Amino acid sequence: KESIRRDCERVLYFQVKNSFTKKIDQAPYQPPTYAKGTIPRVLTLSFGEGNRGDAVLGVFMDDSGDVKSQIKFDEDFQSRDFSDSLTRYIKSNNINPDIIGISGFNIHTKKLFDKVNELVNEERLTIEYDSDKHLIRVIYVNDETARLYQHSSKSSAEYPNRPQLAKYCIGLAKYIQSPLLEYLALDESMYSLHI
């Protein structure tokens, strides 16, 4: 019984190790016409729980890892005003995203994803390297590390004047920019993940 227990524990150990290896083995997102491993410029959006009251918060991170121009939208995301505000925000000369990431707490995030994707496709919002032109990509972001990041005291000390949802957006953008370092930043909390 002891021998079979030890053997099965070894096999399960190697299976868990392989699963975790599959989890953390991810390169940063490669923008088109750029060499693999280049850090992209990221814009992340999330209204939170998707309720009536909840507003959409955006965070833009450049390729150097510096958070720039956090903004708050003060209108219903299903209206034309939100679309106009997002179009003005993206087309601003000081912001040039390579990818747009979206994540949330429930199925209402699908409406935001579809709205942003339809707006990007219709307005033809292309990547601004400031030739061939490519539209910005809109994806769902796995928020395994963002939900623990937003409550961490390190994040709170880093950004004292920001709410939790802003920290969630920063966590999503950091995860897009470097998944490995975001997993490392969890420290003892990474053993509680679903491996």
């Binding site: 429930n106 199925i107 796995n142």
Partner: protein, 207 residues
Amino acid sequence: RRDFHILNEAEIFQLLTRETVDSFRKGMVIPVYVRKVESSYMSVSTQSLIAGNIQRQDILEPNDRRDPREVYSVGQTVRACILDVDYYNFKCQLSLLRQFTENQVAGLNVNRNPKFWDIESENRDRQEEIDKQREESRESRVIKHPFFHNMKSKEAEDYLAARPVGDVVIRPSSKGSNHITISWKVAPQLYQHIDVLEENKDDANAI
């Protein structure tokens, strides 16, 4: 490193709902919160906010002919069985029929091979569990009457032995609380037990 992983339909569904595509699939039975009731369709919302739908052929029983509005009401919660899942649009179809909601109990593919599963012990244990679910509670009956005495048949005969012919005693019947046996002395060491059936009883102890 490998390229950045992009979520597929199943991963997006698991991300947004926290229900895997294994624990939410065809044939499962879940409780759903009814939201709309119409003549031909019914719209419900599950626990994880996935919008369900049930059609006229799946609301009412084949022998039923009443209108769907009379049968269910908004705000009520019922059990339903999944008939289809659309993992991309977060929509599902359900059925409230008895054949789907209740009969499908063995939802797990347990390998019940006779050489690999103890079938007979399982059957004996399940039979004993049904024989324990058949257990019931029971208690004596109390009646207030001058000629009523809580005695057995032989006890009533012995009580009537000391009394002359024609005296009457009343005792509870063995056929149930709805029956009363009346014993009267026909002759010395000869007694007749007559069972009386009670109708329109106000209570078990009542007359």
